[PDB]
Design a protein around this ligand. Structure first.
Ligand SMILES: *[C@@H]1O[C@H](CO[C@@H]2O[C@@H](C)[C@@H](O)[C@@H](O)[C@@H]2O)[C@@H](O[C@@H]2O[C@H](CO)[C@@H](O[C@@H]3O[C@H](CO[C@H]4O[C@H](CO)[C@@H](O)[C@H](O)[C@@H]4O)[C@@H](O)[C@H](O[C@H]4O[C@H](CO)[C@@H](O)[C@H](O)[C@@H]4O)[C@@H]3O)[C@H](O)[C@H]2NC(C)=O)[C@H](O)[C@H]1NC(C)=O
Ligand SMILES: *[C@@H]1O[C@H](CO)[C@@H](O[C@@H]2O[C@H](CO)[C@@H](O[C@@H]3O[C@H](CO[C@H]4O[C@H](CO)[C@@H](O)[C@H](O)[C@@H]4O)[C@@H](O)[C@H](O[C@H]4O[C@H](CO)[C@@H](O)[C@H](O)[C@@H]4O)[C@@H]3O)[C@H](O)[C@H]2NC(C)=O)[C@H](O)[C@H]1NC(C)=O
Ligand SMILES: *[C@@H]1O[C@H](CO)[C@@H](O[C@@H]2O[C@H](CO)[C@@H](O[C@@H]3O[C@H](CO)[C@@H](O)[C@H](O)[C@@H]3O)[C@H](O)[C@H]2NC(C)=O)[C@H](O)[C@H]1NC(C)=O
Lengths: 22, 48
């Protein structure tokens, strides 16, 4: 890609996975 | 097309093309993956 920029894409599943881990 | 339908808006030209491919049922990722190649075809075409 030309002009792409840095950023982080949040994951909706992650918090449930983290809580499920706990 | 925005200027036609209302207030003229700023938009990078590459962004325009992305929509147009999306207009014809083509995922915009194709364009960016081949922006350079597409440009040359367009540039060559206008010359021909
Ligand atoms: C957008 O994301 C890109 C991915 O990296 C993320 O973003 C950077 C800013 C960091 O925050 C990083 O933590 C993130 O994950 C980022 O591109 C480059 O990302 C890496 C780490 O992710 C950083 O080092 C770069 O590595 C790549 C690949 O590594 C191999 O090749 C290099 C080439 O030299 C080797 O040095 C390595 O040991 C590996 O074998 C390199 O392609 C890249 O090249 C730059 O550095 C080299 C060496 O100094 C120079 O010769 C080049 O001219 C480049 O300056 C890096 O070495 C690094 O943070 C980041 N590169 C740069 C220049 O910042 C990108 O920067 C982010 N921002 C954008 C795209 O605007
Ligand atoms: C989808 O359709 C398009 C049609 O345009 C293809 O792009 C064209 O592909 C042809 C064949 O490669 C290109 O014709 C060549 O152009 C070269 C100059 O520009 C680049 O062209 C190719 C990209 O296609 C690059 O790989 C190449 O390295 C160049 O950077 C010429 O140099 C070529 O000459 C060849 O033969 C001579 C003599 O044998 C060798 O010395 C050369 O090294 C080279 O091997 C050739 O004329 C054409 O230019 C491309 N279009 C445009 C605008 O550039 C896509 O490839 C195609 N994609 C898929 C997946 O099918
Ligand atoms: C969008 O327009 C801006 C107009 O400035 C472009 O920024 C400029 O782009 C040129 C060519 O890439 C840069 O020149 C080179 O930059 C590198 C990296 O900094 C440097 O090492 C070289 O010596 C040379 O100066 C120029 O710096 C840059 N100017 C800025 C950031 O102020 C931009 O590239 C354009 N982006 C797209 C997708 O078209």
């Amino acid at each position: 890609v030309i002009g792409i920029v840095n950023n982080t894409v949040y994951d909706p599943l992650q918090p449930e996975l983290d809580s499920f881990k706990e | 097309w925005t200027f036609g339908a209302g207030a003229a808006l700023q938009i990078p030209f590459a962004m325009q093309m992305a929509y147009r491919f999306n207009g014809i049922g083509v995922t915009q990722n194709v364009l960016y993956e081949n922006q350079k190649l597409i440009a040359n075809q367009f540039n060559s075409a206008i010359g021909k």
